């Protein structure tokens, strides 16, 4: 939190990206409550699959202890006994009633939560 | 306008079934009076002058902060679930009785229906 | 149970300090007081260095448990202290507050120090929640004090017991009353 | 001195701290501290005026012998003011210095801290009260008055050749038996040339109210950092050498730093949270570098503005051009200085000090102090005082004057700060409401010269300008305002007046006097100057303040009084 200053949607631009900010708008509607999680295991390797980003799933089998008769070509059995669960809601945002709606209409933006 | 309001039944243009659903129903006239005229005159000009009342506005009594009213309302509705006392019921009942009797008498004091429907809704 | 009632208990304790007078406009009290000479230590209670340091009269030094290594080893002993740990003066939670108000004008390292006292306080308290997490069958003849200190226990005192009477009345009635086959109240 | 007289101070007392001032509170809270230290109970007081003072003493009709007032005294031969004073100990410590001599003399009930490089008024009593002409304190040739009265043997005594003293010349007659009166008036009037030089032409202020008090309590071994800051507040009020003079600035750079720097109680272990001993730095009287963006606070001060003329557009153009050379971004010029990024907000003053040398401003930087309580934020040198003046909040509750005083004195603690930000906010909104009138009045051409001065009058009441501090501030922003750009170089030097409506008080048309430009040491005529018309016609005037430069009239009894007061 802070008390720095609110900005306006008309300036949320390529420079203002990956970057912390402050605004003030108004709300319209937003989604239901779906799902998301962080990691999980797979029977093929039996390791909780650790990720930086919140997908590539490489080639080799890891049920290779079958002799020479191995299982290539991505055999991944996702084990959601072993997965996680966080929230996800997709909040929304309309712009102000005084900040370039004048000779125009107001745009808006969609959002995210965990 | 007020022509309908001077003489009788041109009140609504559409229907009496939405004359039904509402309780307190208000004429708006602008009947003349020069005292009223001048007082309206300066009253709004003293408003309408230089974005006038910043300092000497809130110095009135306690008439303040619609913000407070947002909070006050969202409180007071969210708790209390009242209902009547016994002594209120009989007089209100008899009052509605006399209301419908007077409406019906104006029906009879003109020999024709002169009333609003005395509803259970009232 | 209060913030000061225990200073009628705790603040009467003593250290020994240095004044800048010798014996004053009065010499000395008929009492356990020592003779007053500047430039040398003197033993006093700690309801007065308060009065004196801020009266701009003296310096002061702490006890020795007010240190680092004692307060770096007491904690790790206290970790697996399934019951309790080392107790340097047993109400150091009140001495240290009335110490660290003013004296940190010249006390050394008055911050990492505070860090540890908080670090030990919280843990010992939290332990004193989980003792409750085994209390079954009315065990009001079995408890722990063995190296307890007092500034932690008064934070519980009025809560449980004014309940625990009618709580375990159902079973304290058992070794105090009689009925037919079922349990009594 | 009172390393001896302070040892008198144990019995009962009354500590009065005369009408609102920042010298007052800073000088007095320290002494409240001092006096609950040696176990004395005492009395602090709000002062609403000289009548408030006189009723106050009236309510304290005891024999409290150690009476104390501070930052006042030049009103009367105050034994005439305060008759029942018999040998009662008073203490004066005022910097309103042009004070009476009967208060100085009569070494009974007063404290002559007479210490000054001006030995100019020594016989100032030796002829006005000591001589007289056409007098009754005398004898007659008849035998009914055959008693010797208070024979000064001077003009105070008879003028009929009965004066045993006055042994400079002949006795019976110089040219006549009553040439006594002739020479009496010769000296009387030829040196009223210098008496009327005192008190009837000009007034000023002198020295501190409470830096002497710091040295007093310094001799008792107190290193109270906060007391340095409070006295700093007391001085930085009228450090404003344009408002009322400091002078010693480049000498107090030795004095106070020497008080505080040389005695370093911790030279190696001070990197701590609470009250890490005060520092000193060279910074501005730009209003409020810290908690606001540039571009509003670059705009409400007079000195930054008047030299670059921003209440018209073109000033903003050159402004932007100097932000250009500075290369500040406009967004950054509209986020709080602290709310800026780092490197700019570090190097800001670092660059501004040297490349404002070249573009019309020279006199913005000062020498002052600042410090932390803790980790919240780093408060500023004067942002207390400009929060204080905003606490003179004359609301219609009737308690708020004295209550706001009591609040203010309860502010400069390290404790009460939720209100201090309040004071900042209140200050800012008033500060740009100042500007809000200047454009209206300049370009409406309300600058009434009306002869030998400039003159303003206003029409209704603002809560800003109910009280007169804001009024002097109005007058002292417009003045530079107008006289920059509407004049040739001839007439930039004339004084200024300003009406001040009080719709509250039934119609009185308050006024404040204020002076022409750029003469720091050559100060007010208006120690008395208004009183001329008071003599000539004279209508319901007041001089209630120990502040001189002020009056209070009727709503409408001024204009003819002004026409008399033309000269």
UniProtKB/TrEMBL annotation, chain D:
Encoding gene per record: Cdc45
Keywords assigned by UniProt, alphabetized: Cell cycle, Cell division, DNA replication, Nucleus
Protein name: CDC45L
Primary subcellular site in the record, as a coarse category: nucleus
Compartments, record wording: Nucleus
GO biological process: cell division; chromosome condensation; DNA amplification; DNA replication; DNA replication initiation; double-strand break repair via break-induced replication; mitotic DNA replication preinitiation complex assembly
Renumbered residue ranges of the record's region Disordered: 133-168
Organism: Drosophila melanogaster
Cellular compartments per GO CC: CMG complex; cytoplasm; DNA replication preinitiation complex; nucleus
């Amino acid at each position: 939190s802070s008390n720095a200053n609110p900005t306006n949607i008309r300036q949320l631009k390529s420079d203002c990206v990956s970057k912390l900010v402050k605004i003030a708008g108004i709300i319209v509607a937003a989604s239901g409550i779906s799902a998301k999680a962080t990691r999980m295991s797979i029977q093929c390797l039996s390791c909780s699959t650790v990720i930086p980003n919140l997908y590539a799933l490489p080639r080799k089998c890891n049920t290779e202890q079958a002799g020479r008769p191995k299982c290539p070509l991505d055999p991944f059995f996702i084990m959601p006994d072993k997965c996680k669960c966080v929230d996800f809601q997709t909040l929304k945002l309309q712009e102000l009633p005084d900040f370039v709606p004048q000779g125009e209409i107001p745009r808006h933006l969609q959002l995210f939560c965990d | 306008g007020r022509w309908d309001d001077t003489k009788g039944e041109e009140n609504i243009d559409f229907m009496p079934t939405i004359l039904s659903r509402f309780d307190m129903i208000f004429i708006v006239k602008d009947i003349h009076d020069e005292s009223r005229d001048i007082t309206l005159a300066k009253h709004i000009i003293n408003v309408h002058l230089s974005s006038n009342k910043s300092a000497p506005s809130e110095p009135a009594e306690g008439e303040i902060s619609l913000s407070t009213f947002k909070k006050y309302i969202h409180y007071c509705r969210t708790h209390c679930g009242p209902r009547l006392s016994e002594a209120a019921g009989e007089k209100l009942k008899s009052r509605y009785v006399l209301m419908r009797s007077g409406a019906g008498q104006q029906e009879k004091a003109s020999d024709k229906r002169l009333s609003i429907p005395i509803t259970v809704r009232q | 149970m209060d913030p000061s009632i225990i200073e009628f208990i705790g603040e009467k304790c003593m250290i020994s300090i240095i004044p800048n007078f010798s014996n004053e406009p009065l010499h000395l009290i008929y009492g356990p007081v020592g003779p007053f000479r500047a430039g040398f230590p003197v033993f006093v209670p700690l309801w007065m260095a308060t009065h004196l340091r801020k009266q701009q009269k003296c310096r002061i030094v702490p006890p020795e448990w007010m240190d680092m290594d004692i307060l770096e080893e007491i904690k790790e002993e206290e970790k697996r202290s399934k019951f309790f740990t080392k107790m340097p003066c047993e109400h150091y939670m009140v001495v240290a507050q009335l110490v660290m108000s003013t004296a940190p004008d010249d006390v050394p390292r008055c911050e990492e120090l505070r860090t540890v006292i908080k670090d030990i306080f919280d843990i010992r308290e939290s332990k004193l929640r989980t003792s409750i997490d085994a209390f079954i069958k009315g065990e009001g003849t079995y408890a722990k004090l063995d190296n307890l200190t007092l500034l932690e226990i008064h934070s519980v005192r009025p809560i449980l017991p004014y309940s625990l009477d009618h709580i375990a009345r159902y079973q304290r009635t058992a070794t105090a009353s009689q009925r037919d086959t079922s349990m009594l109240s | 001195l009172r390393n001896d007289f302070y040892r008198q101070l144990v019995g009962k007392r009354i500590l009065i701290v005369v009408n609102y001032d920042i010298d007052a509170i800073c000088a007095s809270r320290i002494l409240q501290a001092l006096f609950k230290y040696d176990h004395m109970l005492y009395t602090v007081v709000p002062i609403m005026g000289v009548t408030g003072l006189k009723r106050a003493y009236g309510e304290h009709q005891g024999d409290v012998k150690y009476v104390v007032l501070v930052n006042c005294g030049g009103c009367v031969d105050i034994v005439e003011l305060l008759q029942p004073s018999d040998d009662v100990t008073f203490f004066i410590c005022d910097s309103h210095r042009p004070l009476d001599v009967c208060n100085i003399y009569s070494d009974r009930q007063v404290c002559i801290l007479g210490d000054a490089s001006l030995e100019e008024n020594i016989p100032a009593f030796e002829t006005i009260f000591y001589d007289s002409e056409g007098e009754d304190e005398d004898e007659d040739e008849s035998s009914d008055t055959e008693q010797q009265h208070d024979d000064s043997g001077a003009g105070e005594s008879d003028q009929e050749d009965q004066a045993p003293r006055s042994r400079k010349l002949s006795r019976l007659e110089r040219h006549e038996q009553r040439i006594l009166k002739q020479r009496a008036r010769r000296q009387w009037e030829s040196e009223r040339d210098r008496i009327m030089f005192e008190y009837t032409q000009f007034s000023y202020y002198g020295r501190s109210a409470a830096l002497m008090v710091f040295e007093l309590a310094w001799k008792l071994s107190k290193d109270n950092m906060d007391l340095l800051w409070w006295a700093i507040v007391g001085i930085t009020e009228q450090l404003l050498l344009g408002k009322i003079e400091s002078g010693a600035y480049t000498l107090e750079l030795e004095q106070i730093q020497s008080h505080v720097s040389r005695l370093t109680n911790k030279t190696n272990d001070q990197n701590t949270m609470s009250a890490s001993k005060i520092t000193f730095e060279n910074d501005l009287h730009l209003v409020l570098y810290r908690h606001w963006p540039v571009t509003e606070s670059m705009r409400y001060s007079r000195y930054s503005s008047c030299q670059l003329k921003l209440w018209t557009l073109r000033g903003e153009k050159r402004l932007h051009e100097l932000l250009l050379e500075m290369g500040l971004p406009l967004v950054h010029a509209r986020q709080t200085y602290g709310a800026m990024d780092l490197v700019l907000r570090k190097e800001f003053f670092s660059m501004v000090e040297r490349l404002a040398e070249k573009y019309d401003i020279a006199d913005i930087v000062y020498g002052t102090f600042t410090l932390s309580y803790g980790y919240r934020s780093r408060y500023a040198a004067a942002d207390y005082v400009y929060a204080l003046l905003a606490i003179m909040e004359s609301v219609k509750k009737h308690k708020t004057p004295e209550d706001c005083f009591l609040e203010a004195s309860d502010a400069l603690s390290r404790q009460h700060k939720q209100l201090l930000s309040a004071g900042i906010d209140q200050a800012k909104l008033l500060h740009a409401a100042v500007f809000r009138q200047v454009q209206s009045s300049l370009e409406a051409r309300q600058v009434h010269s009306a002869g030998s001065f400039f003159y303003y009058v206003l029409q209704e009441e603002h809560a800003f300008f109910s009280y007169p501090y804001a009024l002097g501030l109005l007058a002292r922003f417009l003045l530079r305002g107008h006289v920059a750009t509407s004049r040739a170089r001839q007439a930039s030097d004339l004084p200024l007046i300003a009406s001040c409506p009080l719709n509250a008080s039934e119609g009185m048309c308050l006024l404040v006097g204020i002076v022409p430009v750029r003469e720091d040491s050559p100060r007010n005529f208006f120690g008395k100057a208004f009183e001329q018309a008071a003599q000539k016609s004279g209508v319901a005037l007041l001089q209630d303040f120990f502040e001189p430069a002020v009056v209070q009239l009727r709503q409408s009894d001024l204009t003819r009084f002004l026409d008399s007061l033309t000269v």
